[PDB]
Amino acid sequence: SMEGILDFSNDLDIALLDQVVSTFYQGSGVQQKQAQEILTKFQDNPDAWQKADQILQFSTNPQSKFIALSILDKLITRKWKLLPNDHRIGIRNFVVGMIISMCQDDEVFKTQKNLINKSDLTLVQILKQEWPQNWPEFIPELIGSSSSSVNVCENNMIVLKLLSEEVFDFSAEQMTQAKALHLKNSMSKEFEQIFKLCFQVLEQGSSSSLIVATLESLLRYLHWIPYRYIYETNILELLSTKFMTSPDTRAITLKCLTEVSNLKIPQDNDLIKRQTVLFFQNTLQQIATSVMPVTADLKATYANANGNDQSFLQDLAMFLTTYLARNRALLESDESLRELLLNAHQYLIQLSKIEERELFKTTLDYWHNLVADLFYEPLKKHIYEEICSQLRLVIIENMVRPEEVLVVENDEGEIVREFVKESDTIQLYKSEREVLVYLTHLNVIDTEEIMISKLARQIDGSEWSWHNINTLSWAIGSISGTMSEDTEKRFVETVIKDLLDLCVKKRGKDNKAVVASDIMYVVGQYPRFLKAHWNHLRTVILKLFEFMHETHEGVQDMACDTFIKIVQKCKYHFVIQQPRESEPFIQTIIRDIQKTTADLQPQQVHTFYKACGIIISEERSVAERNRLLSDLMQLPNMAWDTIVEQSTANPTLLLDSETVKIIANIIKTNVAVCTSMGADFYPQLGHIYYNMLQLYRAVSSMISAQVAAEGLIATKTPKVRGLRTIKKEILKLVETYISKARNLDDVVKVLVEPLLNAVLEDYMNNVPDARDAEVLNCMTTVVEKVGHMIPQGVILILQSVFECTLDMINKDFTEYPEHRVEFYKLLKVINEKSFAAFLELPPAAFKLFVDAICWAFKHNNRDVEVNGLQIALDLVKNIERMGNVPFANEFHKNYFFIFVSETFFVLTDSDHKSGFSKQALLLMKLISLVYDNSNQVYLSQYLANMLSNAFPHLTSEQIASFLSALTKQCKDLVVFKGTLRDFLVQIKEVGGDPTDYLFAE
Amino acid sequence: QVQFKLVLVGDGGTGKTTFVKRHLTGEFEKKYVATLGVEVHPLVFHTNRGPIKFNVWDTAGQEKFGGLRDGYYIQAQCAIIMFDVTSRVTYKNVPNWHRDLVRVCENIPIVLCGNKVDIKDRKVKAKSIVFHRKKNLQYYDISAKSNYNFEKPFLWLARKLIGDPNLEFVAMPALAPPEVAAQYEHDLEVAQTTALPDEDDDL
Amino acid sequence: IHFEPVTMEEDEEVLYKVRAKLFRFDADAKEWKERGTGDCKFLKNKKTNKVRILMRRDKTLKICANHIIAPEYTLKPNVGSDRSWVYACTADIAEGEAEAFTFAIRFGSKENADKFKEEFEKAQEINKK
């Protein structure tokens, strides 16, 4: 029914087209869906453009005419060149006529702005093709027709707006360099006439709709036009006064002045300086008298969201911050400008109180710009003392929750642990801390007064609330480091005393959890204080140990994070023997570790052991450190020694769910301690290494056996997942130590050999769904650290993992995403640290290597694509190093022209644009090899033939010119890339000018 | 019941279709099936001001599947622009999608969404996302996989479209369920032996 | 002087509450598809003493489960989880029409799963009477 439109043998039924369009937009369900696939096919018809003429004059549906212009847009963009001058002149004529038609019908011009904007845009597409070479009178004719009708004038402003955008704003990656410069130079040559028109209607225009469209085009012009059109005319006076009073022009006027406000002014010119001050003085005046005074409550206005107030306040914030970040120095020296400077900043203070995350970030960025300048610039901070004093209040009252604070209130009003990590407020908190740290440095007394005073009104209760005590505590913690040690001492003392009093007064686990999180954060932020008073440090730690038994999981988790946070800064005070103490405190901690961690979860127990490891590594006496390490690992070592007696006895026990979990936690504990101790962990590793690799083997047997007896689904069961967890923690432990080992000799001589015998064969002889990608990640670290010391070891790694892993990932880009990523990280480091291993590969395997590198090229996944291109780049370098030997010669005979064609494919397929830069770099490297050694004639021959068959719509000259330019520029990457982008533009159309490739000539 | 046309635009692979499906059925589609042209989906939310219905035009982001392209934006009353915080190129193309959108829809509420904040290796830093400021767009970090801020875009649009900044999502009424054997024991067996996805998640 | 100044769950008791993620099996596609994550509640009607499951999604609060805890329903384990249960349901009205589903529900821990099973069976005895 609706498909008769698709049959082009018969004429087009416009009345039917109008209904198909109506069904798609105003319809629903299957009727709408079917009309969608039909309209798509009608548009995709290469001959649909021929029906555009009749649709535009015999259609009643504006949407149909819109789709018609879209069809013409495709043609004008891609095939305008091959179009006989018969159609080119005609299409221009009825598009122009259509535009004139609508501007005369005041009803159409009012109600169908969508179709007029589209038509105007389609005309701009023609201008890009024909103007000014084949249409030199367009501008003088456009200006002449402006006076005939107010609608014509307004619409011409729209055309010029879209023109400026397509030429200056969105031309970079849509035209060739040559054409872009041609169109930019054209507009620049005739802009004087455009500006005179624009300026005349601005001074003598009463039609707001016309004034706005003129101001819209002006905003685009400001992106590029010479400064003289801005400051040498009267236009700044118009924008900053006349057009700020009417709301319908205020938004666009403010955006215009924002652009002006960002311009870098020649600092030597006093007339621009005075002029830059003037339009700012006027703008603030019009705002204070026509919108709201400086005392207005912008917070409330924004929340009410009446009309365009929210958008206006956003634009005002953008204008003030933009202008002041650039030109505030113009206002700081002259006393007559002081009130203007401070009034503007007072508006920003009021804007900063608005409840709007993104708007606050915008103002906060400016405040950072200001306080940082007041921190370094002499004689400036006294100007803003009142502004800064207010700002300290703003920031302190709007501190966002830092990541260390793990408690939050839900919809029932109960304090619970956070489900998710609020990742989008971490950055905000760090920005707030930066500004508040500056403000504290600018007047440390004022900041203490505000915080102490606020803390008082929390005790007396006049302002008590969870939100008020949280923001205050967070602010207190954030300014750590700004005060002197003595000031900080009494400041922290006072804060603790008062927060403890609240913990007493406030009852109920909800109130108790809030204060607990606030004190822990404050204390964690002031290690300098804890260091200076051992009594304080000890008391804190022992109270953190108490909180590890608390039933509220929030308090419990934060106590462990705070413990390790304090240890990272005060570790030294745990290894020394403090006066009035019998032994270092690490002795006490290790001793009671079982009691202290009894109620913790495995993850939390591991954090505790990791913190202990941090402390142990501060002991630089090997004997005492190793003794402490042995004492710390007593519990896991006892459970480990017990379990190896049973894994030897009957491996059937490993089927026990609880035994598996115990093993995993033992190894996770060794991982945690190794993470914080690094090379010093070697003794504990030697205690378990050989038996641990034996366990790895025994666990591998059970996994393999389980799969065969239950199928591949076994890998999903808890039992197998638990067994695989053991293997992955063992590899993680070995990988953690090797990555931090100082003694690489013992790594090679002791660890590497048993490791490879235990993991490689198992990996190779498992079914794909049972292979752990962690093996590859582990081998990568081995090669990275000792690869240069084990040439035969690297070879053995390749044989076991290379071919069997490639067959897993070479059937699509989807399956085994981890193996895919780790696989190419391993090849990457091998190619760098032990390229000799690839020379030992038989010619067949080395062919698979090349096939694997190019396979990575074609990934959209950035984790794989990047490493694929890097390997290619480094593999070329590796061959070039070999000089003129048989292997190098054979490589160029067999694989050079594969890399060339494969690199060119991803450069031009429009589906790998993310890697353009590295693609171009690799291509430049390949080409440059030939132009250093003829070999150069054949390369041009090959490339010319390749591109001819791959892009048959290009002429021989286009390809010839492109390769001439590309081969001359294989030493200038910036120009080399510009030539490729020109080529990518020309392959999307027909008839591209081959002289465009002489742009850099 | 009020109706509003919402267009959803963004580079291919940024998660537009996954985001819509999550709100439609609660599922998380792990596979990438490129959308063709556009898929319209009715979506209803319950608010203290009554139910609000969005007609979501989930357009295709890939070039070769654009279909009518800017023809889908006609008469849209709001929009979402989507990009991927793990792919810098998707943020670089935000200005292009916005350009084509506001050329048709001069004055509509638009939300800019940076999706996939669940992934560890984030490539588009928070400090770099600033395009929404001069264009008066609302911005949210979101994650269709973790549901992080997944309701914010529609909540904000609903407040702008209804004109009530205090509008809230409310619990839909829960009617009483009714009281009540061959090919069930067969379907149950299959579902029993098909492992649940994402067994490592906290839920 | 006198100055003049300026969910359909209320009739039900909450027997049990727990966080969970609900799946529904797509037989054709042959895979599990999430349906919602939030609080799973056992609600006993004070008038009829009939107990049902009601589960709403976080944030949107849309219903992803609403059905009687039928006495003939049976909870079975999933092959790849020790903190989930699967069972068939012949009438769920979360999305409107009383459809039949094979549901799976997963919890934060095995403990919460086992406790869910205990309360699920308690509710089945209540519905029996």
Ligand SMILES: Nc1nc2c(ncn2[C@@H]2O[C@H](COP(=O)(O)OP(=O)(O)NP(=O)(O)O)[C@@H](O)[C@H]2O)c(=O)[nH]1
């Ligand atoms: N890790 C993660 N992956 C996501 C997230 N959202 C979507 N994805 C994944 O991104 C891929 C593409 O999803 P899709 O919705 O089809 O993207 P699209 O924008 O609709 N593509 P197109 O424009 O071509 O139709 C899917 O595989 C999906 O699993 C997310 O929030 N986090």
Ligand SMILES: *[C@H](CC(=O)OC(C)C)n1cnc(-c2cc(OC)cc(C(F)(F)F)c2)n1
């Ligand atoms: C209040 C918090 C609280 O007790 O809540 C729990 C969950 C019931 N509160 C009381 N005492 C402290 C306190 C005392 C300390 O002695 C110096 C040290 C801390 C520490 F957390 F900072 F270590 C806390 N908190």
Ligand SMILES: [Cl-]
């Ligand atoms: Cl040694």
Ligand SMILES: [Mg+2]
């Ligand atoms: Mg899609």
